[PDB]
Amino acid sequence: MKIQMKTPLVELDGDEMTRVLWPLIKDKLLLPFIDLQTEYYDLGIEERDRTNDQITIDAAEAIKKYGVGVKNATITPNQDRVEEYGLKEQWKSPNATVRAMLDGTVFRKPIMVKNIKPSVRSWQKPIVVGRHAYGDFYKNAEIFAEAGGKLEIVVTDKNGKETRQTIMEVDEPAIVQGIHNTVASIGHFARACFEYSLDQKIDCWFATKDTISKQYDQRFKIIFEEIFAQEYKEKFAAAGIEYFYTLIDDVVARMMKTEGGMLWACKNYDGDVMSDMVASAFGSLAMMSSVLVSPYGYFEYEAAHGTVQRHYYQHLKGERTSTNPVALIYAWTGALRKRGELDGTPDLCAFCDSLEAITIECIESGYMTGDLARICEPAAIKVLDSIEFIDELGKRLQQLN
Template structure:
């Protein structure tokens, strides 16, 4: 007998995506969410063809809707390069949708591993969680770059608002054939935001500039801060037991969160939540890409075994935040059981090929893993069992 659907009072923003993650996204909704939850969804298609058709305005509108409704759940999307421009016959090389959304929301991305007891860690010494706190504003993703065509001086100029004087710094004196240049920025407000969700963990801040690190306004009372250069921090992280927030600049956080995910087991086992400064607005997503290689197989009708756990957790964590904002205990209980069903399914020995390879090695047999849809079906079965147990009690 089916349980009565959980009614959600306020809307959530759904941002659809590209390629293989778009395929599993649809399956997750229809097998793990819609049978149990009655939702008002504000849907935005962030697939690359629609972003091109709307001149990327759909991305801006999805971010604005997130600010209005406070909860967004996002599928992985393509950031086009020259090859993608040609493949999709795009009008132009659109910027990263994540970069556009994050700069409108102005928050901090927190990424943590999803731990399954039977999945071996590549870094076995990590016995405590490590959370990456990553700028979601400025830095490399909003940089201004230029190709220098010949000899000349490159300068950095700052003109204070309301004042005539300006600061002018000479960056480099190009000679000969020229080269390339890049200018990045961030603000005290968004650097500070990285430190707002540390809870009781030790806090490492990884900022190359000692001028930023030395600003006492960027340190909160009651927290233990330690500054390390990023090369030193990577070495330390490998030999540490974990148990800290690792605060990174935007691009560094992107790279190191993949390092973290792989060290704990798999790139498919990583949560990613953008927390806005108001503490009320979040965007949950999978930390990985669109799994193009699997999508090419899927397009040809071949069998795939794509890990959907991070995408499932995007839904669970987004809905959990909706539940907390609304005081919806049934919805919160559902999200906890959905996450437990994912982990329980893997720990029972049912998993996708990427995880089976970690346990059985490169000679893993087909019988030792599930394909894409089989895994989602297994999670759905486990979820129904957990919900049924609660209902009987």
């Protein structure tokens, strides 16, 4: 029989080329081997528009209920997209929405192949970015103060005690931004990072600009230091690993020189930008896994890249594309593995191990999409289009099973 699942995955569909490839993955790589159970939520742009973005919230609720989600790449619509699709508004990033609702830390890890050298000469070991998923400027308040004025932040507690601080007082057109985070969210971030480091036996590096931000960034620094001292110090020393804190400018300068091999903990914004820099440098944003690990027990595996508009238009014209589906594949395998772990269904986990291994073997053997063929050494034997590539992996799986 096919591999059986005890609990369904929550499945969040997406946009454009990634939407096109998603059912081909299911058809060729999963359904022939697994009696795949999912709760399906279409987060394509048109369905988010139809439902006034309720579908996004509903999907996040389902992840909370079942425990594990898999997410396809989506469009966060700018005004071009609004015009292209005739949208009601510039709907908020669905990633930002899910992360807000679930909380946690997003772990981003390169999917490494031996035949692609990183951009950064020194890198010999993967660098994992642990990005705080919650708060900061992903939930902002902003004012365009067209006549200027006294610009303040204000906090009013339960009890009515008001605290005010002045940003600046200006007599000219100005812009203002406010952000927050929570002590609890930061603590869970620190914990997730330290636990990841211990599990994987890698050092943890964290950095902020605590010299400039003497209460906000300072609070991250203190919380990591205290959690580390009180909960992890001994565990780390027994495991032969270290926690290193520095300033953000110093850590980035080090990253250009390091051999790699650590967990790089980042505040939300830093992690968003830096995970993309690391992904690119190792080879591709499609060669990078992404998992949100919530302290509340939820997991969301996603393809953390664009939807490939140019390739989608080509596809609709009957042209084959060089789209790299690896991140999409690893979102499914990561999610099915976790679901299998939680459910105590190890045949599912073993399948996921196999498909991941097959994907790497295929690329390392010189059979790959065009983006990878551009940067590998030695030269690829054969460039496979996105659909041929998926078809090839399906043939390898059939030969296993």
